[PDB]
Design a protein around this ligand. Structure first.
Ligand SMILES: NCc1ccc(C(=O)CS)cc1
Ligand SMILES: [K+]
Ligand SMILES: [K+]
Ligand SMILES: [Zn+2]
Length: 357
């Protein structure tokens, strides 16, 4: 089995002209790439080239207006760049942002194509800016276009329209954009785990609560696992996977798994406040590899401690390459609120998934 890897230094060009220390740093991707080299994982992977997404591809998920506005930023002077970014929630823009967002998406399309044609079994995409907060019609939360959502639709466009895609979003933040894009869709199952705090944590919406199960044709196909009142870590994530993610995923029987793999739930993250370990992410990856005949694409989302994200994503790639899982620390009993969260999701989704009964 072959594992693909996409990384392109051009995605470092997106930068914050006013706050060069903003946490969504260019070196997030070069540091992850370096750690793959240091651990001798890079030479064990097959390099997949980056490419630009086309505007037609962007329209798989995004409005023509939103595409046009971000595209227009390539030609803006700093004053226009600053004013435009301030129109969104938590966005900075440079003249290279649009290109970098296109490369992040195109890299993932090429990776999904390699998986779906059997050139590689699985793959990892070391991309920025991230995607999961981007909505059909707007940028948000450091994200311009929803790379994972676009990759699901691209995957369908090269196979069949109803290809079953599972998106597991383990970034510490709810992927509001991904949920909304697929909220009425039963071909793309969205499962997010996220710090919620009764709606107080970014992106600050009750759309992230467990009772949002999807709409219309998509009822049952949106699974939110929201954490409240606890510094969650490996025990809680393992339990959510055992009780919720894996039973639902096996019942859905995806033909492709995309991971919105933010590493901001990681021990050491300056924004997430959680303590998932690199060995925890490895175990989560190893479990997902049992789905979809192993067709798994791991897409970088957030994650802001450069050391934590480099170790964590490298451990995921080690799993994709077939290395055995490292040993978890002794798992403490779940924080009591985590048991409450899991049981709330079970009650919300047992109507739709007989594996939860
Ligand atoms: N300014 C609020 C904010 C916006 C985005 C993030 C992420 O980490 C997105 S993945 C965190 C905080
Ligand atoms: K998430
Ligand atoms: K859905
Ligand atoms: Zn995040």
């Amino acid at each position: 089995p072959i594992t693909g890897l996409v990384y392109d230094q051009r995605m470092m060009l997106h930068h914050n002209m006013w706050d060069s220390h903003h946490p969504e740093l260019p070196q997030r991707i070069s540091r992850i790439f370096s750690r793959h080299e240091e651990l001798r994982l890079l030479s064990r992977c097959h390099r997949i080239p980056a490419r630009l997404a086309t505007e037609e591809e962007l329209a798989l998920c995004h409005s023509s207006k939103h595409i046009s506005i971000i595209k227009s930023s390539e030609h803006m002077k700093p004053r226009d760049l600053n004013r435009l970014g301030d129109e969104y929630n938590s966005i900075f823009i440079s003249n290279e942002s649009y290109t970098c967002a296109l490369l992040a998406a195109g890299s993932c399309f090429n990776s999904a194509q390699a998986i779906l044609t059997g050139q590689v079994r699985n793959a990892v995409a070391i991309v920025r800016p991230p995607g999961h907060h981007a909505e059909k019609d707007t940028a948000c939360g450091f994200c311009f276009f929803n790379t994972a959502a676009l990759t699901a639709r691209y995957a369908q466009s090269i196979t069949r329209e109803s290809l079953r895609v599972l998106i597991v979003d383990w970034d510490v933040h709810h992927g509001n954009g991904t949920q909304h894009i697929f909220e009425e869709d039963d071909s793309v199952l969205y499962i997010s785990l996220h710090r919620y705090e009764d709606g107080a944590f970014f992106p600050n919406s009750e759309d992230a609560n467990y009772d949002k199960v999807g709409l219309g044709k998509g009822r049952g196909y949106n699974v939110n696992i929201p954490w409240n009142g606890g510094k969650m870590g490996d025990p809680e994530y393992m339990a959510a996977f055992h009780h919720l993610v894996m039973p639902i995923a096996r019942e859905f029987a995806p033909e492709l798994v995309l991971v919105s793999a933010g590493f901001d739930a990681a021990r050491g993250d300056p924004l997430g406040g959680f303590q998932v370990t690199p060995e925890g992410y490895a175990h989560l990856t190893h479990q997902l590899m049992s789905l979809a005949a192993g067709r798994v694409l791991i897409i970088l989302e957030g994650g802001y401690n450069l050391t934590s994200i480099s170790e964590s994503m490298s451990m995921c790639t080690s799993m994709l390459l077939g290395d055995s899982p490292p040993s978890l620390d002794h798992l403490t009993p779940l924080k009591t609120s985590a048991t409450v969260s899991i049981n709330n999701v079970l009650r919300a989704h047992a109507p739709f998934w007989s594996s939860l009964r």
